Amino acid sequence: EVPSKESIQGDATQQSSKEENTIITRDQQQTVSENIPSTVGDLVIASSEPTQQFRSLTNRWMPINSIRVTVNGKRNDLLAQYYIPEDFLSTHAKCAPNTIPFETYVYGKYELEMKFVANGNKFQCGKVIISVKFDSYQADNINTGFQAALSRPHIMLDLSTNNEGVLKIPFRYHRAFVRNQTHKTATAGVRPGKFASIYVQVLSPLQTGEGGANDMFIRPFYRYTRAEFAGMSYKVPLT
Amino acid sequence: EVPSKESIQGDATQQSSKEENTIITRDQQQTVSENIPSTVGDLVIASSEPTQQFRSLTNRWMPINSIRVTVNGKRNDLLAQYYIPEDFLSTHAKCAPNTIPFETYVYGKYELEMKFVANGNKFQCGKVIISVKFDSYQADNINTGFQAALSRPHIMLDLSTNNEGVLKIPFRYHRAFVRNQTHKTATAGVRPGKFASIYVQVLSPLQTGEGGANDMFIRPFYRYTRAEFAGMSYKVPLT
Amino acid sequence: MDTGAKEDEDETANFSDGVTAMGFQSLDTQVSIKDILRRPVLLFNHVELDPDYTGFFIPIMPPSRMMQYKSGDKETSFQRLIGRTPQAAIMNLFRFWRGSLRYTIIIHSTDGHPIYVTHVPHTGNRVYGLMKVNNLHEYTKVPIFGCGLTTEMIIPSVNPSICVEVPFDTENNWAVTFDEDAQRNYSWRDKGDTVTGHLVVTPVVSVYMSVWVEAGDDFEVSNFYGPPSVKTNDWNYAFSDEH
Amino acid sequence: MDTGAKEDEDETANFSDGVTAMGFQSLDTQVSIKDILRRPVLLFNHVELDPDYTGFFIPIMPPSRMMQYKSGDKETSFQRLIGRTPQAAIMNLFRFWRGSLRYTIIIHSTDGHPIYVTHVPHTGNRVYGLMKVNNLHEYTKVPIFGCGLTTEMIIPSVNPSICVEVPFDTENNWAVTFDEDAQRNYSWRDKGDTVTGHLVVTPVVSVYMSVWVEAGDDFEVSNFYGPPSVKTNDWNYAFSDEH
Amino acid sequence: DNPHRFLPANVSNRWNEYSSAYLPRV
Amino acid sequence: DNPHRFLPANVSNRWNEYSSAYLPRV
Ligand SMILES: [Ca+2]
Ligand SMILES: [Ca+2]
Ligand SMILES: [Ca+2]
Ligand SMILES: [Ca+2]
């Protein structure tokens, strides 16, 4: 919260997060969304058998794809978007150990946390907003602007201060569990692997100074704070 | 007094002043001159009838004219100067509600406060000094250099740090009251509306870097901390 | 819901918060979301019931953009202002709802013929209007109100109106309020998750009816979505107080 | 109110004040101003409702000189004796009123068609009678009773009459009872301060209705104006007890 | 036929919804 | 047109009401 005078290694007042075998430091402050509840009480009824957790595999930080922000981005533009858990299983960081349990269990309840790290320089400026939309299947294209993002659980990133942001995502779905994988033998009547959407949008365009860089980058990291699996099956490759 | 690490809105550690229906914030520190006394004891004798105050009108902050500082200003140069209360009634911020009582009372005792806000950038530099000279009529052109300013009540402004300054001005006059307005029917033997002078001078020239701005601005704000009026009369337009 | 207060880091002085005017004119506060959703919304205004059909179907779903009229699109039997009612506006902010809905049905008649209202639990489809179930050509011998489903009757000569409360008979935790495209052909089991069943009205002879809907007492909404893109052209249709 | 007792300085002897007769014949005292204002006044006697219009508008305002008939002026749908009712006479003495009004509406019919009564809060205008809002030519697809405003329904086959209480939904502290000239074209925001909104009656088919108004229980009047210039020619229309 | 039935292939995934890879939808 | 709409200029003020200077109104 408070800086110190310069020494051999500059202003050594960083903070950090350690989850399992992964650590992430931050140079400035961090903004965190509220810790909110998931539906509880349906788990013991939707599954006659015990559900499982594998924290050492799922609760570690995993970086996903890099996000490029340029001076040409306009307010409301989608910089990136994720359908979860689907995109974290078959499109981003595919070899991550966090994905292991999804190969053998057919159902699950998931609570996540997403950390966003930005690196714009002191002569740049801009604002980005990241928000989550619960149970978004077939409703991604409405209530999808920066206004809806500012109303739902979200975090804001300033591109010159480089504050970190942590989005806490509870499990809010219209069914007890979300299905983990599609399969040639599984039904096509229910689209699986998606209980929410994460949007990364431009709030105010990135700007730079004379001869400055026309872009900068943001990196998202995810981790399950609570991943419960149900319905064991033979292992299958993801999507 | 102490900065904090950067967050969404930068280093959010501003301070502010609220007087009546006006608020003024400051990004850095502020320098304030000593709170000194005015003559007391003559009020009840110079005016047989009770004197009045209208704090809600007079004790609010009112911005006056903008001051431009350029790289061509030399030490000792007058950037601005005010004969008060006169210049705050008929030349600067003329429609200000702070001027209302002066339209109907012929005499007054005034104690003010003047806040100066500067905005030079981090690659500029320079020093400005603001001072007050009590009962200056016919003595403005002597004891008027930066040296006399450094000896009288004053505040110093650094053009790159943007510290704010507050000059506290008591009522020190050779008579019990100062006259508020000149009038075709009033005597010409006594020059009215001036019990003091405020000078804004260059202490060290503004300098800038390669291709930098050749100027920056300062804005003065005034408010009466104690304005007592005496001698009610019909209302008249100011000067 | 995230207020955004977390992003307001300024701590400098401000003007007063004043005193609330709520309750100054009267004690009839109208800001409770559930209170708003409990007042009736007109769905069908004087529509026809034909005995040649199984009955007139009413999908159990609250008012929202799913029933909004858009100038230029095909004419439906839905009243055109549903999309601008306060309750539809509220529902357009919540994608989840659970509980019962109440339907006020009025049969424009004074006859002694009974009109039946039958409740169908969640079956997977989503239809409205007159329909011949399984495309038969006669239904008086195989009436839907006589098959075993919960049914209630209206006898216009006694009271042409009735108010029925339909349960939350579905397999899901929540009903899905709306979709971005109500006519998109996507995964069929998901397609039917925007309703919790149907209400079917069956007459003896041809007659007209009107239908209103509102939230029941055991009802909750959730999964706040934030506001959608909107439009308004109200200004153009009235004079200002300066001519 | 100033009694003028302040100007009666004489203190010489007088005859007795006697004993009051109030309550001698019965206990039905009728001098309370609120009691008087709470008994119904006929506004419209058998007027037509036409489904081609949005509905028949009733401006929310108590009876007064604003509705007085003057021999020779244009014919309006207002009953002609409103201006001589005791309650109009009382209201002509008070320019302020606050609270609710109660309307008793009777639909001359026994049909099973619902007739809706919709309440419109203070919007700035002051109209009465049949009107096509925004001058359209069809309103069954865009009914005012289905837009979100508070609405109640009458079903003549059950009861052709209803009594509805309209709230004091306005921005002002008091509603202004009357003007010296109800037809003068002056500052438009002030012009609409004599009403607190409207009541709109909409039928399914053409039918007639009658309307009565009275003060609600939560109602007050004030800003006593003193008596106006009046006239009377009663003497000429009856015999005296001496032939 | 009805243009709402199916989303064009270039903007959707196999589930007839906008692909998460299709950023231009806004 | 309607004679009630506007008061004659000589008896009224800019607000279309009797001027307080016009004493003859009674
Ligand atoms: Ca404060
Ligand atoms: Ca306060
Ligand atoms: Ca006596
Ligand atoms: Ca006596």
DSSP string, chain D: ---SGGG----S---------TTTS-S-----HHHHHTS-EEEEEEEEE-TTSSEEEEE---SSGGG---TTSPP-SS-TTGGGSHHHHHHTTEEEEEEEEEEEEEEE---S--EEEEEEE--S----EEE-GGG-S--SSS-GGGSSS-EEEE-TTT-SEEEEEE---SSSSSEE---S-TT----HHHHGGG-SEEEEEE-SS-EEEEEEEEEEEEEEEEEE---------GGGGS--TT-
D20 alpha carbon – ligand 4 mean position (Å): 14
* AA identity, residue C198: H
Assigned token pair, B209: 């870097």
HSE at residue B50, side-chain half, CA atoms within 13 A, is 2
CA–chain centroid gap for F21, Å, is: 11
Ligand 2 centre and the CA of C17: distance in Å? 7
Name the residue of chain B whose CA is nearest to C14's CA: B23
Tell me the CA distances in angstroms from F10 to D25, D182, F14, one per residue in order.
57, 21, 11
Tokens of E26: 């806004």
Cβ-count burial of C4 within 10 angstroms (0-12 exposed, 13-18 middle, 19+ buried)? exposed
DSSP string, C190-235: HHGGG-SEEEEEE-SS-EEEEEEEEEEEEEEEEEE---------GG
The alpha-carbon radius of gyration of chain C (Å, integer) is 21
Residue type (1 letter), A39: T
Q: What distances in angstroms separate CA D7 from CA D4, D17, D224, one per listed residue?
A: 5, 20, 20
- B/e letters for A106-130, b = 16+ CB within 10 Å, e = fewer, are bbbbbbbbbbbbbebeeebbbbbbb
Pairing of strands B30-32, B164-169: parallel
Which residue in C has a C-alpha nearest to residue A76's C-alpha?
C229
CA of A151 to the centre of ligand 1 (A): 26
Beta carbons of C12 and B14 less than 8 Å apart: yes
Q: What span, in angstroms and rounded, lies between the C-alpha atoms of B125 and B207?
A: 5
Helices in A78-131 by DSSP H: which ranges? 86-90
Do residue C85 and residue D148 have CB atoms under 8 angstroms apart?
yes
Residues of C in contact with D134 (CB under 8 A): 237
Cα(C148)–Cα(C153) distance, integer angstroms: 14
Chains that touch B (3 or more CB pairs under 8 A): A, C
Pairwise CA distance, residues B31 & B164, whole Å: 6
Nearest CA in chain A to C227: A148
Q: Is the peptide bond before A85 cis (omega within 30 degrees of 0)?
A: yes
Q: Which letter, b or e, does each residue of D91-119 get, where b requires 16 or more Cβ atoms within 10 Å of its Cβ? A: bbbbbbbbbbbbbbbbbebebbbbbbbbb
Sheet strands (E) in B88-175: 105-119, 125-134, 154-158, 164-169
Minimal CA separation from B63 to chain C, in Å: 18
b/e string for B73-97 if b means 16 or more Cβ within 10 A? beeeeebbebbbbbbbbbebbeebe
Cα→Cα distances A222→A77, D8, D127, Å:
22, 91, 63
D170 shares contact with chain C (CB less than 8 Å)? yes
**Residue in this structure with the two tokens 């050594």, named with its chain if needed:** A12
Cα(A102)–Cα(A108) distance, integer angstroms: 9
Pair F16, D185: CB distance under 8 Å: yes
Structure tokens at C183: 């006519």
- What is the secondary structure of A125-159 as a DSSP string? EEEEEEEEEES-TT-TTSS-SHHHHHHSSEEEEET
Residues 6+ positions from A48 with CB-CB distance below 8 Å? none
Match 């207020």 to its residue by tokens. C3
CB distance C55 to C130 below 8 Å: yes
Q: Any idea what DSSP says for residue B51? A: P
Please answer yes or no on whether A161 and B6 come within 8 Å at the CB atom: yes
Burial of E1 (0-12, 13-18, 19+ CB in 10 A): exposed
Residue C7, classed as helix, strand or coil, is helix
Contacting residues of A for C68, CB less than 8 Å apart: none
Count Cβ atoms within 10 A of the Cβ of residue B22 and give its class: 0-12 exposed, 13-18 middle, 19 or more buried.
Answer: middle
On the CB side of D200, CA atoms within 13 Å amount to: 25
CA within 13 Å, CB half, D172: 20
* Facing residue for B12 by CB, picked from C9, C14, C15: C9
Cβ-based neighbour number of residue D123 at 10 Å: 13
Q: Which are the contacts of B174, defined by CB distance < 8 A and separation ≥ 6? A: B135
CB contact under 8 A, D184 and F15: no
Structure token digits, residue C125:
């489809």
Helix, strand or coil, per DSSP, at residue F21: coil
C13 contacts in chain B (CB < 8 Å): 16-18, 23, 25
Ranges of H-type helices in B47-198: 55-58, 86-90, 146-151
**Which residue shows structure tokens 């890879």?**
E21
Q: Do C186 and A191 touch (CB under 8 A)?
A: yes
Residues from chain C contacting residue A175 (CB–CB below 8 Å):
172-173
Q: What does residue B101 show for φ and ψ, rounded to 5 degrees?
A: -60, -25
Q: Is C181 on the interface with B (CB under 8 A)?
A: no
B85 prior amide bond cis, ω within 30: yes
Contact C184 E6 (CB under 8 A): yes
The answer for C 94-113 residues in CB contact with A (under 8 A) is 95-96
Could you give the count of Cα atoms lying within 13 Å of A124 in the half-sphere of its Cβ? 24
Burial of B226 (0-12, 13-18, 19+ CB in 10 A): middle
Which of A126, A139, A106 shows the shortest CA–CA distance to A217?
Answer: A126
Asked whether D202 and D120 are in contact (CB, 8 A), the reply is no
The total number of residues written for chain B in this structure? 239
The whole-angstrom separation of Cα B171 and Cα B148 is: 19
- E interface mutation test: which of A76, A191, A202 has the most E CBs within 10 A? A191
Rounded to the nearest 5°, which phi and psi values hold at A234? -70, 155
